[PDB]
Structure formats: structure tokens, C-alpha cells
Amino acid sequence: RMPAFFETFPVILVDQDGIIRADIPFRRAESKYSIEQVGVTIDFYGGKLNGQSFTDAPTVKKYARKAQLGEVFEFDRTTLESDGVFRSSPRGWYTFGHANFA
Amino acid sequence: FTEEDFRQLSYEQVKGTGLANRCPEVDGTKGSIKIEKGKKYKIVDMCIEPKSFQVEDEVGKGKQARKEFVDTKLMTRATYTLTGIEGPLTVNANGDLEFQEKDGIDYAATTVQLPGGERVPFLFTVKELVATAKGDSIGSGTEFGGEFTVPSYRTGLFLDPKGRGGVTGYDMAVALPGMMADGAEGQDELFKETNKVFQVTKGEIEMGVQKVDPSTNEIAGVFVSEQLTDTDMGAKAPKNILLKGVFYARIVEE
Amino acid sequence: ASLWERFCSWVTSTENRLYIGWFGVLMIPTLLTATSVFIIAFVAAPPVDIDGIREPVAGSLLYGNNIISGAVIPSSAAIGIHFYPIWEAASLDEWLYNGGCYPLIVLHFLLGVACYMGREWELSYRLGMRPWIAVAFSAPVAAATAVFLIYPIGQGSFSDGMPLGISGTFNFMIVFQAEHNILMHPFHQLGVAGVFGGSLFSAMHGSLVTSSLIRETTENESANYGYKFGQEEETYNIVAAHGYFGRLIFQYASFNNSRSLHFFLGLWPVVGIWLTSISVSTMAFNLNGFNFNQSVVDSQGRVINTWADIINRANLGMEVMHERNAHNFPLDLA
Amino acid sequence: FLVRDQRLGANVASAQGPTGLGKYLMRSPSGEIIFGGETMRFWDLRAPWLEPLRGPNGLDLNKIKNDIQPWQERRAAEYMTHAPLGSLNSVGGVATEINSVNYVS
Amino acid sequence: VTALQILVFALTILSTILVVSIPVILASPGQWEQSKNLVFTGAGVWSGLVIVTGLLNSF
Amino acid sequence: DDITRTIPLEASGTTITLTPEQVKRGKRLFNSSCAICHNGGITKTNPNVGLDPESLSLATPPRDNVNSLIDYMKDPTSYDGSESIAEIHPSIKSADIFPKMRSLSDDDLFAIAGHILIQPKVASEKWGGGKIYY
Amino acid sequence: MINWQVIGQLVSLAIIVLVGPAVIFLLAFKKGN
Amino acid sequence: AYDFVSQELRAAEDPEFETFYTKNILLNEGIRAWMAAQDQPHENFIFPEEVLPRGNAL
Amino acid sequence: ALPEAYSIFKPLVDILPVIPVFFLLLAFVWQAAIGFR
Amino acid sequence: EMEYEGVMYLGGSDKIDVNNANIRAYTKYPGMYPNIAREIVKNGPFESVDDVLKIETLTATQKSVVEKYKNNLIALPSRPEYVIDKLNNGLYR
Amino acid sequence: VAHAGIMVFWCGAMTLFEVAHFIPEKPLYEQGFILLPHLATLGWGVGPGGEIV
Amino acid sequence: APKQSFFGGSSASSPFVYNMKQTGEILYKPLNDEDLQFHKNVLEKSRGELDRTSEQIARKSWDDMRGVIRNQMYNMRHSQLRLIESVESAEKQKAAKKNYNDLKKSLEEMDLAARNKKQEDARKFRASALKAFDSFTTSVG
């Protein structure tokens, strides 16, 4: 997952030891290991996709980039005409106002 | 301004003057070039210079109106001609004398500007040219003509202003991560400006000799070239462009 | 009494509202055509191929570009440092695509502040005073020569110069510190000690005057109304502000000569910006900053990183990503 | 790198460089055949190891293809690595190079 | 030859006495009206020994 | 540290022990005779063949041993053993065209080629990799 | 194993620093200047 | 104050719109992806050489 | 290097370019000894 | 394109896939890079895997050096975005 | 002429400083030589191809 | 206690070359048979390039014949220097030293007749430098 300090993060896949296994690379030429090279399969569990598993290599890269944001969610963004950049909570807006007033 | 008038000039008096891209004239008429069916042959030094770049634009676009090629103005520099497009001529299709492309500066990336302020870029090339002409003699007539495949303007490893590319680059609008965080029907699908397609199209040419010399110095003739323009790796629709300038060549006996 | 001397005594007349002297015969028409092209090409210039790689950059107000993004874009790198005026173009819009507006502003602006600097001499002659405010203006004029002219002279094209815009200056600084390491250069190091030091001594000397004013005023009204303009006496005790600051640090760390104090105000930022303007111009000919990459090694020869390596991992990351498709060969201008 | 990729068998003209322009060989704004890349700003170079390859219209495409004699590859590979790019403590590099040479020009 | 080697070594010894004791002798209140050709003797043997070192360098 | 500088001599795995002096002699002579083109194992004028531990092994004489590297600087070849790249590369054979190869002995070619094999044993990812491991 | 060069470089530096303030130190002593 | 959202929507919806602001964003992703393995070593950023954003030819 | 007769004097000509820095610093010593008068 | 199914053949594995692989992908096999892979990227084998062994302008000892690594080569449909940067690729160490 | 002496004394002492650290295998520019390229432009000691003897 | 050294004592970080002198012999022989054959090999090459200059004088293309005298023949004065310091006797060395000097003088007068675009004057300086090239090769043996 991307930490809170970053803003763009490469979508690297790790095991439970920290070692990489797939990376969806920036440079496709002479990429040693990619999503479709090692062939990762998504097995969804719970939610809207309870039991939907697919090994299509274009559709694995779609839900790989979203799951570095932490959890996948269906967004209704034709209501407020949303622009697609993350705003800040009232926990973080209060602290901008109050540590600058003080 | 022939070859034998141009080779006597030093580089210190050609450089800067705009004469180094001027497709040299090759004075002569009442001549022919015989091409034997057994002997090997090659065009060399095939300089091709266009003039009067014209992009086909629609004027009515509903009905009862043509697509008149509006005259544009050149926008980059004097970088537009081609130099040294040698290739073997000795192939003979049941008569036709065809020459295929071998090497040289086939392409020249220039932009022109339509009326309205829009700059169209295009890749004026003759890469993979296969031009046939009816007959075995060359001079004062015998119009060549064939199809050339243009490549796309940008290649696959051309990065965008936002770091997307065909061969390289990001595969998402990475400055909008909240649009990527949608799961169903909103996951940057609005953009297929992301999936960059190196697409390859074809263009036609037709060139007349319009002058000859029986020793060397083949044409100093004219040409008419119809061609597509840049598609921005599959982002905008290409326009047709019509180029009509002066080419020149030289046949050596091989 | 002559037909020229009656004109020659109008140009060198101090009775005008702005002084229009013999250096002002050159800086008034050159800056006014470096203003009239800057104001028009900030609003309504077309996009400019800066790199010569046939990808234009759109830096004017018509093409989007809120004013912390708009810039008069530098020239094409295919042009280089070649002289590119309007009459050496095939058309006026072909001149705009290659970025002709950038040498037309920046050769007239540089020739205008060079004759602002002589005009700052010139009124100090006709008013009868010591003339070295031209020397103090030679620190911004050299610094405006270093980013605009000498860095295009050393590094080749005019595209390497500073863009005339706010976000162009931030792009100029990141690309500079990628390839020249200005942060670890010991003459830029002196310039930020003349910029922080000059900002210290402004906040230090300006404080000790305004904290030791003698009260020629009432309580409720403003303090500045107690200095009648053109008066003979001093408005503040220099002996009390010296006795303040002689208690703050110690007694002989403070100038109770106010002429040597005020010269030290004119020496610390002006010499510091003289050393910055050298440093950018010596890095223009690629005499870069200090390079302590991989210096600390242990006994086995394994490289131990120091703090100059974490600067270098920043310096390398803004090296591979600036000019993202303008490089075809592995070394940058080598 | 015009030499090296020609020695790998490329037609060194019709390069199709990444921005659409010439990678190795390109056209000058006045119309001369010059080197492509970032080095098109230094197109007005007169240098005694390449001026035996310039004709009247810039670099000749026939003299480059055949008569490219290996004293010129000696002088190109030397002058590329001995570039005027250094440091104040005399480290030769592009300012992000590790220190193993003391060279400023 | 090493006879040249001790000659130029005698030049750097003598010029060390010459470069110190010339501006001492000039800028004393005395010692210049008295000892002009103590300097010009020392400057003469310095310019003398350079010529002797000069054509012995050919041999 | 630096106890093991056990670089292989020739093929079939006979090794040699370098000693401290032959390493300070090697690094000071690899610098200012090679390292203006090989700054950390890269080749600046031909970057798809360098001084990796892998890329030196994948040549027609494998150059991961010192006796094939002494034969390299005495008589250079290309990466497939066919041609002789000597007029575009400095060597003892071409030391008239390259004046830096004119004065150094055979005993410090062993010091220079001892440095090519020591550097992946202490600087393993950095030697021969590009600027990514800087 | 003696260095013999920076011995000679610093014994000649000690000669050089004993030239400049050997003129002034004798001239302060003898009231000249 | 990282980005102008008016110009990030436009540069995603036009692949030939570029400014010095849009060039300044790509320089920031070079800094944040190359320095991150060395600046914050507790995070163990094990970015391979193929996934960090390089430009072209260097 | 140097000629073979003068090769012993190589530690002598290593600091001789530094003497024009010492001539600038000699003027501050001479001014301080007379008392900056 | 954004998705390409033949990315595992372009290097960083075995099975070079000669049609659109780079010239420096042959560095990982000995006896393969400089002049024997001149004729694999020029007059290239756009037919099959065993069209590269029936290729001409090779010496017979060069044709046996391809025979050591016949299983490290496939033939893919030739994409035009990778044929253009087959010789340079913009990828130096 | 005291100061014209110290210009020539720099040219005397630096040119002896360049030739002391000569090392004839390297070129002139690989050693930071600044007055020996001014004398090799005038043809003292320079041979064919640019090397000096 | 740290192992510190004062102005020498050559450890791995001491920047001093008062130690580390060369032990073995210089294995590049200064003038052997293999590169002297290469100097004879380029004299076969350089004589063909001055022979090639005659058709470009007749074609009146100056930047070929001002460039082909620098293209392959750049390592000609270096190789003609190495041949005359290879011979044994001194009185035969004067015969090779003089027509190497009469070659160089003849060669740049052809260049001065090349920049001034003088076809009638460059053809005699070509043939004078040609027979001085053949006079050089039987002087050096």
C-alpha cells in the first residue's frame, strides 16, 4: 500500500517476507518480472464480488492499482461532479486552522 | 544550380544561407536513360523537396460542399526536404521499372498551421516507397507512382506531458488517484487517451521526371504526395495533406 | 544656445518628474519594448516548442495557465544561441513557434538594466553626491545576466535560460540542481549568507532605529508623524541603540559609527549576490558544485553513504525525469 | 553512438527517433545534415576529426556510411569521456557520478 | 653532471640570502648610503652565477 | 576486514590471494587509466557490454578470471571472439595509438584485473549497475 | 620507509614563511620602514 | 499546495497540453521515487529498476 | 618530469606558485607591524 | 499499447522472441551479441522460430552458435512499436 | 614593476610546477595543465597527432 | 585505537606514490615488428588516398579533396615520424628526414590551393607531393 506521505506510488506486489514478485513496470522493454509474466490471479472475497475470481491479465492490472489505495469501493461520482483528487477530513482541516491561529 | 555547380562551394558559404536544402536543378532535355533487363541499377542521392503544404479541410460538412485543401503556412524551420534516398531500380515487373526503398533520410518531421491557429504536425516521408512507371526509358514523361507507408509521428517511447506512453510510461492518469479508486464503471475508463496506439498508415505519391540527362542526374522533376498526418498515438483523428514540390535523383550503373 | 545644446540640456535636466538622462535614452525605449512584448506574450502567446523536439509548451493566459503556471517560454533548442529576430523568420507566427519572444524580451531587458545602472550613476552626478548606487545595482544586474545570458552562453541554447514566469523559475532551479549541484557550491553558499544575512541586518538595523526614537509626538497618533521631513537633527539616539546592542552581545560587537554600520549594510548582501552571480555563471561552463558522492568507505571498501548521497538520490531523480524525451544518448551534454 | 549502432547493422539515417525527429542524423534549421538528439544546438561545430566527413550541405551520408576511419572513433570515445563537466573538488562526471576520476577540463 | 647540481643549489642558497637581506639593507635608516655595492656585489654574483649555470647546461 | 580477496586465476577454479598492496596498487591504477570510461563497471561509450560479474562471464573467453583479463589487455577481442577490437580500445598491442598503455607492466595488469573481480565481492549491486544503485 | 618528499615540501615551506616576516621582523627591530 | 486540479483534468484529457507546472509535477515523481529507497530505509522500499520513472536514454 | 639534473629540486617547485598568495598577505603583516598608520 | 501480452519475452527471462526483442537481449547468451545478432535484427525472421537457422549471410560456425540456443527463441507477431527501437531502445546502463 | 615582477614570477613558478608533475603517458588536459597548452600551441615540443615529446 | 598514519605509511587510503613502484618489466616494447608493419600498412593506405585526389580536382569538388587529405591520412605524419626513427644509419636518415619535410611542405600548399579554389595550382602540388611520397618509401626501405 502507498503510505500517507507519498502521492504517486509504483504498484509493487510483495509476499509476506517483503520480497517483490510482480511490479507492473514503467519500462516494458527488458522488464524481468511483471503482472502477466508471473501470472498473478485475483481471488476476490466478500462484498460485491463474493466468489468472482479471474485470471485475465488486463483485468488483473485494473484491480491491482486500486488495491494499493487500501480497499476497493464503488464510487458514485456523477452527483457532486467529482474531480478525482483526495480532499482532507475535518480532522485535518481543524488542525490547519487551529495550529495556524495559535 | 546543378550538382556540378553545388559541389564547388565550400561549407563555409553554404552554411546558414538556406541553400543546403534546396534540391539541385539538373539542366537538360532531348535525352533518355536506358535500363537493361539484366544489368543491376540503383538510384542514389534522391533529394526530394516539397513546396505549398496543403491540408484538406471541410467547408460545408453537411451536404453540397467539397473538402477544399486550405493553404497553410510552414511553422517549424527550413527542415522539410529529404536527402539521399537511394534504392535498387533494376527490378522489372513485366516491364514496369520499379524501385524499392533502401535507406537514407526518408522522413522529416515538420508542422504546419491551419487558419484558425491550429498547428497540425505530420511526418513527410517516403519510407517503403515502391514506385512503378510504364516503359523502359526514363526522361520527359514516364510518371512514377506508388504507395509509401508512413510511420506514426511519435514513437512508442515518447512520453506524454503526464508520463504516459506506448512502449514506456505510466498506464494511468496518476495525478488523479481518486478517479482510479473507483471500482465499477469509473476506473479511469473515461480516458482511452492513456492506451497509446502506434498505428501505421499508408500514403500515395506520383512523380514526373520533367527533365533528364543521358549521362547521370536523373530528373529534377516534380511530385505530388497525398498523406495522412499525426494522430497523437491514437488520440485525435488525422487530416489529409497534399504536398507538391520538386524532387531530383541520380541513376548509377551497378 | 545651439539647436542641439537646447536639446542636450533637456535630457540632462533634473527638473523632470523622472530623470531622462543619456542612459535613459537607451533604457526607456528598450524596457518599454521589453514590457510591451512581455505583457502581450504573457496573455496571448501561442505554445512554444522550447526543446526543438516538436512538442510545444503552452505558457500564456489564453491557453489555460493561471499565473503561477504561465511563462514567456524560452526559445527553441534547434535555434540555439543563434540570433533570432523577427526579420529572420518566414512569418511572424513561425517566429512565435520557435520562441522568438524570449530573446526579444531578454536582450532588451538586459540592455535596459545595464542602462538603468548607468542612469543610477547619472542622477548621482547631476545632484552632486557620491555615485556608488550603480555598484549596488550591479549585484542584481549580474544576477539577471547570469540566469538569462551567461547560462545560455555556456550551456548552448537559449532554452536553458530562465523562463519569464513564476513556475518557470521553479523548473529552472530543479533542472539546475540536477546537473550542476548549486546547493553544494561554496559561492551560492555565500549568497544565501548574504540573503539571510542581509535579511538579518535589515531586521536588526531597522529594529534598533525604530526602538530608540525620541518622542516628538503624542501618544494616540502615529509615531511616524514626529519626523518632519528635511529636518536637521537625528530622530533616534544612536548612542542608546549602541548601548542596547552592546549589552546584548558585548560592547565591541556593535558599530557606534553609523557610517561604518551603514556601509556594512551595503557590503553584506551586495558581495553575496556578486558571488551567487559568479557561481551560476561558473556553473554555466560546468564548473559544478562539490561532489562528495561515495567518499566515505570502510576497511573492506564497501561504500558508506553520507548526507551528500541522499542529496544525490534527489539530484539523480530530477536528472532522469527532466527533459523526458529530449535525450537520445546516455550522458547529459557530455 | 552513430558509429556503434551502424556497426550493429542499422541504417543510421531513417533513425525514427523518439520524439519523431532524427535520433542520429537530423536536419539543421538552415537545412544542413547535422547530428540529432540534444546536440542539435551545437550544430555549428567545426572540429578537425569530423570535418573530413562534411561535404557542402553538412555531414555527407555517403562518407559517414563508408569512410569512418578508426582514428575518429578513437577521438570520439576520448572526447565524449573527457567532456568539460567536473566539480570544484575535481570529480569528472555529470554532477551525479560517483568519484573515481579527478578530471575537470 | 652533478657539478651543475651543486651550482644551482648554491644559487638557491645565495638568493635566499639575497631576497631577505636586500629589503633589509635598503629600508634601514642607515646601510644604503654606506653599502650600495654590498647589494650590487651580491646582485652581481647572483647574475654572475646564472650565466655560469646557463652555458654549463649546454654541456 | 578485507580478509578474502580470493579471485579465480584461470578456469577450473584455481584461486589467488591478492594481498593489501596489490589492491591499493590496483585501485589507484584502475582509476586514471580506465575509470574515465568505467566509472563503477559501466562502459560509457558501449553500455550494453560492461564489467558486470554476469556480463564478463558471458563472453567467448569468459572474463571472470584474471588470466583471461591479462590476455584481454595484451590482446583485446570483441564480445564474440571473432574480431579484434584493438584500434578502438587501449591495449599493450595498441599502445602506440593509446599512450596510456605504454608504460605499465605485466605485474600491474594483475593488479588492475584484480580490481575488476574484487569490486563485485564488496560492492555487488553497485559495480556494473548503472546510476540506479548510486 | 621514509617519505622524503613532504618532508622536503614542508621544510621548504618553513623556509618560505621565514622570509616574509623575516624582513618585517628585522625592520620592526631596526627602526626603518 | 501540490497541484492545480484545473490543469490536471486538462492534461489528462489532452495529451498535448504541457506547461512548466506540468513539467514540475514529473520532476517531483522523479525525486519521490529515486530517493525513497535511500532516504527512508526503515520502510524497506525495494523498487526494482523497471518500475521507477525514468525518462528516455538516461 | 623535470630534467634529470634538476629532479632532486621537485620538492622545491611544489610551493613556489603559492608565493603570490603570500605577497598579498605580507602587506597585511607589514601594515599590522607599523600599527596601521 | 497499455496492455501487451508478449512482455515476458522481451528480456529478463529466456525465450527472446526475435521479431520484436531488443539487440541487447542477446547479451545474456555467449557468442551472440555483436555481429551474429546483426543478422537477427536486420533481415529478420518474420516467419517462424526455425526461419532463423535457414537465414543466410552467416558463417557455418555462426549457424551452430544459434543451434545452442534454439529453445531460447520464439517468433511473435511483429508489433510496430517495438520494431522501431529494435537497435537503440533508449536503454543504457 | 614590482607587480609586473609578480606576474612573471607566477609564470616562472607555475610552469616549473606543471613540468614537475608531468607524467608523459597522459595528455595535457588530463593533468590540469594551463600554461603548457599555451606553449604547445606555439609549437614547442608538440609532435604529430597532438602528442608531445 | 584507530590505525592512524602521518604523511606516508601506505595503507589503503594513503594518497602517496613514494611507495608502489613498478616491479616487473615494461611489456610494451617501444618499437617492435607488429606496429611497424602497421605503419607500413597505413603507408599503403595513405598513398591510395593521395592517388584518389586527382578525380576530385577534375570534378572541382573542394571539400572532398580538402577532406580526404585529412580523412584516412590523419595518422600519416605520426607514422612517417615513427618510420624515420626506426632506421639504423644516420646518413640514410637525412635522406628520409628531408623528403618527409618536403612532403609536409608540398601537402599544405595543396591545401592553400584548395581553399582558394585553384584547380590549375592544386594539380601540380598534388603530383609534387605524390612523387615525394614515393621518394620517401625507398628512403626508409
Ligand code: CLA
Ligand atoms: C532557503 C533556501 C534558499 C535561499 C535563501 C536561496 C537564495 C538564493 N538563491 Mg537558491 N536554491 C535553493 C535554495 C535557496 N536559495 C534550492 C533548494 C535550489 C535548488 C532547487 C536553489 C537553486 C538556485 C538557482 C539555480 C539559483 C539560485 C539563486 C539564488 C539567489 C536568488 C536571489 C538573487 O540573487 O536574485 C538577485 C536578483 C535578481 C536576479 C533580480 C534582478 C532584478 C532586475 C535587475 C530588475 C527587476 C525587473 C522588474 C521586473 C522591475 C519591477 C517592476 C516595477 C514596476 C516594480 C539567492 C542567493 C540564483 C543565483 O544566485 O543566481 C542568480 C540562481 O540562479 N538558487
Ligand SMILES: CCCCCCCCCCCCCCCCCC(=O)OC[C@H](CO[C@@H]1O[C@H](CO)[C@H](O)[C@H](O)[C@H]1O)OC(=O)CCCCCCCCCCCCCCCCC
Ligand atoms: C581566479 C584567480 C584568483 C586568485 C585565486 C588563487 C588564490 C586563492 C588561494 C588559493 C591557493 C591556496 C594556496 C595553494 C593551495 C594549493 C597548493 C598545493 O598544495 O598543491 C597541491 C599539489 C598536488 O599536486 C598534484 O599532483 C598530481 C600528480 O599525481 C597531479 O599532477 C595534480 O595535477 C597536482 O595538482 O602539490 C602539492 O601537494 C604541494 C603540497 C605542499 C604542501 C604545502 C603547501 C602549502 C600551500 C598552502 C600554504 C598556505 C597558503 C594558503 C592561503 C592563505 C590564505 C587563506
Ligand SMILES: CCCCCCCCCCCCCCCC(=O)OC[C@H](COP(=O)(O)OC[C@@H](O)CO)OC(=O)CCCCCCCCCCCCCCC
Ligand atoms: C523613430 C520613430 C519611428 C516611428 C514610430 C515608432 C512606431 C513603433 C511601432 C510599434 C512596434 C511595431 C513592431 C513590429 C511588429 C512586427 O513584428 O511586424 C511584422 C510584420 C509582419 O510581416 P508579415 O508576416 O506580414 O510578412 C509578409 C509576408 O508574410 C508576406 O509573404 O511586418 C509588417 O507588416 C511591417 C511592420 C513594420 C513596418 C514599419 C514601417 C516601415 C517604414 C520605416 C520608416 C523609417 C523612417 C522612420 C524615420 C524616423
Ligand code: HEM
Ligand atoms: C585498465 C584499462 C581497461 C580495462 C581493464 C578494460 C576492461 C574492459 C573489458 C574487460 C572489456 C570487455 C571486452 C569484451 O568483453 O569484449 C572492456 C570493454 C570496453 N572497453 Fe575497456 N578497459 C580498459 C580501458 C578502456 C578505456 C580507457 C576505454 C575508453 C576509451 C575503454 C573502452 C571500452 C569499450 C568501448 C568497451 C566495449 C567493447 C565493445 O563494445 O565491444 N576501455 N573493457
Ligand SMILES: CC1=C(/C=C/C(C)=C/C=C/C(C)=C/C=C/C=C(C)/C=C/C=C(C)/C=C/C2=C(C)CCCC2(C)C)C(C)(C)CCC1
Ligand atoms: C635555476 C632554477 C631554479 C632557481 C631559480 C631561482 C633561484 C630563482 C630566483 C628567483 C627570485 C629571487 C625571485 C624573486 C622574485 C621577487 C619578486 C617578483 C618580488 C616582488 C616584490 C613585491 C611584489 C613587493 C611588493 C610590496 C612592496 C613594493 C612594498 C610593501 C608591500 C608589498 C610587499 C606588496 C630552480 C632550482 C627553482 C629550478 C631549476 C631552475
Ligand SMILES: CC1=C(/C=C/C(C)=C/C=C\C(C)=C/C=C/C=C(C)/C=C\C=C(C)\C=C\C2=C(C)CCCC2(C)C)C(C)(C)CCC1
Ligand atoms: C623564489 C624562491 C625564493 C623566494 C621566495 C619569496 C619571494 C618569498 C616571498 C614572500 C613571502 C613568503 C611572504 C610571506 C607572507 C607570510 C605569511 C606568514 C603569511 C600570512 C600572514 C597572515 C595571514 C597574518 C595575518 C594577520 C595579521 C598579522 C594582521 C591582521 C590579522 C591577520 C590574522 C589577518 C627563495 C629565495 C626562498 C629561494 C627558493 C625559491
Ligand code: OEX
Ligand atoms: O533543454 Mn533545457 O536543458 Ca539543461 O540540459 Mn542540456 O539542454 Mn535540456 O538538457 Mn539536460
Ligand SMILES: [Cl-]
Ligand atoms: Cl541527445
Ligand SMILES: [Fe+3]
Ligand atoms: Fe537606521
